[PDB]
Amino acid sequence: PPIIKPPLPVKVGTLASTRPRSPMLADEAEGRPTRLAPSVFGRHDAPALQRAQQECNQLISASALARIPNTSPRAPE
Amino acid sequence: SHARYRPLSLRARQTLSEKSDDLQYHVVTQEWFGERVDSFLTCHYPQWDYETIKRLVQQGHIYRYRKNGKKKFTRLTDRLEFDELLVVPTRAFWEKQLAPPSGVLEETDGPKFKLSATAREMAHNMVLFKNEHVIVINKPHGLPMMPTDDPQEMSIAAMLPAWKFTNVAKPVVCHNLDRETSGCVVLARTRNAHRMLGRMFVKRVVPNSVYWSFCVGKPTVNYGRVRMHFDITRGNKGDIIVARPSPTKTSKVAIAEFVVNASALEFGSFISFYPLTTRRHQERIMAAHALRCPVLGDAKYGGDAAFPSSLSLFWDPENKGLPLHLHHRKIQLPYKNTAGEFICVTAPLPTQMEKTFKKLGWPCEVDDPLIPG
Amino acid sequence: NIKGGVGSFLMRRAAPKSIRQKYQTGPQFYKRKFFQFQKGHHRLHRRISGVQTGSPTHQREYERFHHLPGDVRTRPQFDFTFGETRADRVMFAWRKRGDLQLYQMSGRGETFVCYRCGYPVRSQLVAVKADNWDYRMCYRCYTNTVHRGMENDT
Amino acid sequence: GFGGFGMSVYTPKKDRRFRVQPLP
Amino acid sequence: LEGVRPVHWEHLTTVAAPFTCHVPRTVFADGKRCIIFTRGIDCATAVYHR
Amino acid sequence: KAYGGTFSRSVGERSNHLVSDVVLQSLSPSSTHNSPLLSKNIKTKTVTSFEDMPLYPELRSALRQLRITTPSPIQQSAVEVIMQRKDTVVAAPHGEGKTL
Amino acid sequence: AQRALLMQLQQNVIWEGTVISDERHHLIQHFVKLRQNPKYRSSKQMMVVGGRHLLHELHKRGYTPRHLLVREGQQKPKWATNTGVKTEIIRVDRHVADVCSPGNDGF
Amino acid sequence: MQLASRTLAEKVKDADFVLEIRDARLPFTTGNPNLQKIIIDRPRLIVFNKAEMSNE
RNA sequence: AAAUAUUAUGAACAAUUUAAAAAUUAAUCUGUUUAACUAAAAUGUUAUAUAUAAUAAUCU
RNA sequence: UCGUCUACUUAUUACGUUGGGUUCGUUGUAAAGCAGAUUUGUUU
Ligand SMILES: Nc1ncnc2c1ncn2[C@@H]1O[C@H](COP(=O)(O)OP(=O)(O)OP(=O)(O)O)[C@@H](O)[C@H]1O
Ligand SMILES: [Mg+2]
Ligand SMILES: [Mg+2]
Ligand SMILES: [Zn+2]
């Protein structure tokens, strides 16, 4: 199994799972992402981490993910 | 089977956390930047209960790294920072000599015991007090609290599925009694109720329970305190209990305040014990050896002396099978009633104790004021 | 054999025995090593107090804590002032917020230990967890618990 | 109220001056 | 031989690089290497000859 | 009696009478709050890999020759501050890559 | 003495693995009274039926008993094992079954 | 004593010989039944007191 | 800013920090006294008990 | 968290005798757990 897990869509929530732990936390889930966060499953060195990133096409640094968007460079027809 | 877990100090636990690579590092990206730790963990681990997540986070098994060279332990209410890591142990992390909290691993019920109609009827009859959090039952004489070495014997641990009136899970016994001791037994209905009531049954300084006993002979003092030090050693088919007046490293103390309420002249006595500790056969040993008055029917401590011929008009001293005259009478609870007093549950005296009291002319049902409400 | 001398004040840094005690990641269930009290107090307990300005006819007893935020600014659901006086002198009881319910005692403040902060607190406001009076909370921890939403957890 | 949680409380002497009547 | 264990940093593990000494080790005999730190010069000299 | 022992005359901190060559200084913030060096700016942020920090190709080959891939926590913090041309105090324990 | 009393209690209240051997058992006397005394029968609104296949046909029709004594050496009925039936099953001896009913079919 | 029979056997194995002290009027009542039940290889010297009061 | 006199009033952890505890289970600390008379003068503690609520009927 | 455990087995027969060999388990917890104490009436 690969060591880098990419973001995946959140699983469908059941009744109790969608129900918050407290009635005051009902507004906490107002703005939430529909996809999970990327993860690394072990302890590795920097060359191994870079090779895993290149093989999985998934960056680990949130700063790099934010600064390098996947956008089309051509103008829309 | 949990047979691979070892006692670990905080230093060893931190060292194992540092060494073990069975960790997952969730990167806090822009989409989860600013969320709460409990929210993040609940969204990322649907198979974990909130109790499990709370225990992990508060005990420090789940932590976070803010690129500072050190680990950061947080509360469930702390917000996540951008471009940090959340370190969570994996399944393989708990396969080493480090035991996880109760919620991490998954237990299997397996078999389910069947209770008959008469068994359920008597289980409902034994109920004394019921609450949203606790159930106090009247365990009788001769009924084991737990399954003994012989698995064919009935027990309160086996009758337990009969006291889940409306709950989904059966209650949990908060304290165990001897096979011969009869009286009030506390069963927590909720897991949180059990965790909160466990504090009430550890060694204390103020007693919250009474033991009414009929001892053979009257002690030299009407009231006082008893303190022994018990050492338990494994024997052939039993336990060797060594009682000492001085403490030892392998010993544990047993303390109880006794009061002689009423008595015959020098042949029998009615004594109320108020214990402060929880030791095996505590009351029986302290009556037989400290007070030098064996409990009526206590054949294990002072066998021939526990069946006196003075009560031969009432009890035949030749059968040697009469029930032990020791009864867990009254117990205080942390829950209050509508009047503002702590709820004190009282159990009626058994048949043999009521018979002895009536033959000696003593009132059976009397409130013991030494344990307030 | 060989004897040396090291003061216990050098080892006091290692007094906490767990993550919960060293970093305060949860409620201090009567296991707290380091305490922070106001400079000058000799009786080491925290004080959540109320201001009395009038008779029970004009100013009600729960209105003393109006300067505090939270449920003390609402009128309670239960009132035990009329009729037989409570044994523990509980005058009012607010609505249950999850597993916590706020009570107001009568007389001088009773000094108890909040299991969330771990401090001895002297106040008339006691929050009981799951109707079990062994686990009590000061009003400050009660307001903080409700604010975060941990009412059903702690 | 000017009380607060951390701030300690004191017992102020009740103002017993003669007050003007409110007006519609 | 050097008993090198993987150094454990947060989410980073590596192995120790060879020693940066101006005299490379060329003899490998059976035994553990050690330094005996003494006080003063005379004690170092004496233990050397003992 | 209220106290029978004796209190030390060290008003600054523990071991105020000794010389710095013998005793080590406290690093707790309650003590470093008045220190002229440790009360000032302190760099704690780190850089994960050597590729994230700017290095010339000759320095890349020197690291490969020395067989060094992942930076140690002191190198993750001190390399960037020195490349910014600032007076730096590289403080680290023994055997953590303080030389490089 | 305590072991004797505990075994007698486990015989009185039917426990797992308990085979009734004493004819003075309360349920055995209940069955004997239902068989013999008509006033007890009319007061309890109960009746005693014999025959494995007869009980099977009654279950098919929709009638199930509340106590099913099975003589030791016979199998438990599949309809009694089924979940929809709430009939308690009891193990009795040969002479106990003879006392409960002179000609016992085993059930 | 049937519970500590095993501890007594271990102590006998550890010792080189055994020295029993009994009362001649109640020889077997005073003697330890564990030593009578267990066959031990260490020789034992028994000392019966009050032999002049006991039966010849 | 000089020339002179004195100086022992005494804190342990945690978090953050080449920027801000903003983690409220966190405080970041030197208190406190200080007022010519006559006038003038701008300052604050009220409660709202029903709208994801409350009061009610039919029927499956 | 006050559980329970002076009898089994290799043989011998008779309606008890004689030779050998010798624990199980409920629940909670992974610390919020583990030794000992938990006392105070200038009634002098
Ligand atoms: N990033 C790295 N990865 C692996 N090994 C390293 C790394 N950096 C340095 N080392 C190794 O660590 C060893 C010790 O380095 P260094 O001399 O800097 O330690 P030091 O802290 O100066 O020790 P001292 O204070 O005792 O002089 C060197 O031999 C080097 O090979
Ligand atoms: Mg100057
Ligand atoms: Mg203890
Ligand atoms: Zn609190």
When computed from its CA atoms, the radius of gyration of chain E, rounded to whole angstroms, is: 17
CB–CB contact E17 F68 (8 Å): yes
Evaluate: CB of F71 within 6 angstroms of ligand 1.
yes
Neighbours of chain G (3+ CB pairs under 8 A): B
| Both tokens assigned to E29 | 């005999």
Bridge partners (DSSP) of residue B183 are: B139, B328
- The crossing angle, in degrees rounded to 10, of helices B50-59 and B37-44 is 130
* Contacts by A20-29, CB closer than 8 A, 24 or more apart: A20/C149, A21/B38, A21/B50, A21/C149, A21/C152, A21/C153, A22/C98, A22/C149, A22/C150, A22/C151, A22/C152, A24/C146, A24/C147, A24/C149, A24/C151, A25/C149, A28/B36, A28/B39, A28/C149, A29/B39
- Closest CA relative to residue B276, chosen from B210, B230, B216, B322: B210
- Closest CA relative to residue C93, chosen from C107, C105, C83, C111: C105
Q: How many CB atoms lie within 10 A of CB B186?
A: 23
- Closest CA relative to residue B353, chosen from B316, B314, B318: B314
- Closest CA relative to residue B87, chosen from B41, B34, B46: B41
Q: Strands, E, within chain B: which ranges?
A: 23-27, 63-65, 71-72, 85-89, 127-130, 134-139, 172-173, 182-188, 209-216, 223-234, 239-244, 252-263, 268-275, 326-336, 342-346
By the 8 A CB rule, do B183 and B329 touch? yes
* Separation of alpha carbons C129 and C112, rounded Å: 14
The H-or-E segment that residue B356 falls in is: helix B351-360
Pairing of strands G19-20, G88-92: parallel
| Both tokens assigned to G3 | 């072991």
- Pick B29's closest partner by Cβ from A40, A42, A62: A62
For B96-109, b/e burial (b = at least 16 CB within 10 A) is eebebeeebeeeee
> Residue B205 C-alpha to ligand 3 middle, in angstroms?
12
* Separation of alpha carbons G78 and G66, rounded Å: 15
Pairing of strands B252-263, B268-275: antiparallel
Evaluate: CB of F98 within 6 angstroms of ligand 1.
yes
Resolution in A: 3.1
Tokens 């190198």 map to which residue? F75
> Residue F34 C-alpha to ligand 2 middle, in angstroms?
22
- In 3-state terms chain H splits into helix, strand, coil percentages (rounded to 5) of 35, 25, 45
Evaluate: CB of E19 within 6 angstroms of ligand 1.
yes
The annotated binding site of E is made up of: 18, 20
* Separation of alpha carbons G105 and G53, rounded Å: 10
Q: How many CB atoms lie within 10 A of CB B132?
A: 10
Please give the angle made by the CA atoms of B286, B287 and B288, to the nearest 5 degrees: 95
- Closest CA relative to residue B320, chosen from B351, B301, B288, B298: B298
Mutate which of F64, F89, F98 to test ligand 1's pocket (most atoms within 8 Å of Cβ)? F98
- Pick B31's closest partner by Cβ from A35, A42, A43: A35
φ and ψ of B244, to 5 deg: -130, 150
Q: E5, E8, E9, E10: which to substitute to probe chain F, counting the most F Cβ within 10 Å? A: E9
C chain contacts of residue D3, beta-carbon cutoff 8 Å:
51, 66-68
CB–CB contact C67 D4 (8 Å): yes
Pairing of strands B172-173, C120-123: unpaired
**CB-based contact, C144 to chain A, within 8 Å:** no
Q: Which 8-state DSSP code applies to residue B286?
A: I
Q: Which 8-state DSSP code applies to residue B49?
A: -
Bridge partners (DSSP) of residue B331 are: B209, B345
By the 8 A CB rule, do G3 and B143 touch? no
- Pick B44's closest partner by Cβ from A36, A42, A60: A36
φ and ψ of B114, to 5 deg: -110, 130
Please give the angle made by the CA atoms of B173, B175 and B178, to the nearest 5 degrees: 110
CB < 7 A to strand I: residues 33-72, chain F:
41-45
**CB-based contact, B68 to chain F, within 8 Å:** yes
Bridge partners (DSSP) of residue B336 are: B342
Tokens 């209690």 map to which residue? G9
The distance of H6 to chain B (nearest Cα, Å) reads 7
CA atoms in the 13 A half-sphere facing the CB of B77: 17
Give, in order, the Cα–Cα distances in Å from B342 to each of B31, B203, B217, B368, C86: 51, 20, 35, 14, 11
F82 touches strand I (CB under 7 A): no
User: Which-ligand-closest: CA of F96?
Assistant: 1
**CB-based contact, E5 to chain A, within 8 Å:** no
* Separation of alpha carbons B293 and B36, rounded Å: 63
Q: Which 8-state DSSP code applies to residue B287?
A: I
Please, which positions of strand I sit below 7 A from a protein CB?
Answer: 8-19, 23-27, 45-49
Alpha-helical regions (H) of H2-56: 5-14, 27-30, 33-37
C64 touches strand I (CB under 7 A): no
**Resolved by:** cryo-EM
Residues whose CB is less than 8 angstroms from the CB of residue B203 and which lie 6 or more positions away in sequence, other chains included: B276, B277, B278
The annotated binding site of C is made up of: 114, 117, 138, 141
The annotated binding site of E for ATP is made up of: 18, 20
Q: B139, B153, B178, B181: which to substitute to probe chain G, counting the most G Cβ within 10 Å? A: B153
> Residue C139 C-alpha to ligand 4 middle, in angstroms?
7
* Separation of alpha carbons C26 and B154, rounded Å: 42
Alpha-helical regions (H) of chain G: 2-12, 26-36, 38-44, 52-61, 78-81, 94-100
* Separation of alpha carbons F89 and F82, rounded Å: 10
Q: Which nucleotide is nearest to B79 (CA to C1')?
A: I23
B174 touches strand J (CB under 7 A): yes
Q: Which nucleotide is nearest to C135 (CA to C1')?
A: J32
* Separation of alpha carbons A43 and E9, rounded Å: 8
- Closest CA relative to residue A24, chosen from B41, B46, C127, C143: C143
Closest CA-bearing residue to C1' of J37: B205
The annotated binding site of C for Zn(2+) is made up of: 114, 117, 138, 141
Q: How many CB atoms lie within 10 A of CB B321?
A: 13
- Closest CA relative to residue F73, chosen from F98, F55, F53, F41: F98
F chain contacts of residue A47, beta-carbon cutoff 8 Å:
69-70
Determine which residue's CA is closest to atom 9 belonging to ligand 1: F97
Determine which residue's CA is closest to atom 10 belonging to ligand 1: F97
> Residue F22 C-alpha to ligand 1 middle, in angstroms?
25
Q: Residues 187-216, chain B: which have Cβ within 8 Å of C?
A: 190, 192-193, 196-197, 199-200
B233 touches strand J (CB under 7 A): no
For residue B290, give the 3-state DSSP assignment: helix
φ and ψ of C67, to 5 deg: -75, -10
- Closest CA relative to residue G10, chosen from B116, B349, B124: B116
What is the layout of strands, in order, in the sheet containing C46-48? C46-48, C120-123, C110-113
B102 touches strand J (CB under 7 A): yes
Tokens 């209650």 map to which residue? B171
* Separation of alpha carbons C81 and E15, rounded Å: 73
The distance of E49 to chain F (nearest Cα, Å) reads 30
- Closest CA relative to residue B343, chosen from B373, B312, B310: B373
Q: Which nucleotide is nearest to C144 (CA to C1')?
A: I24
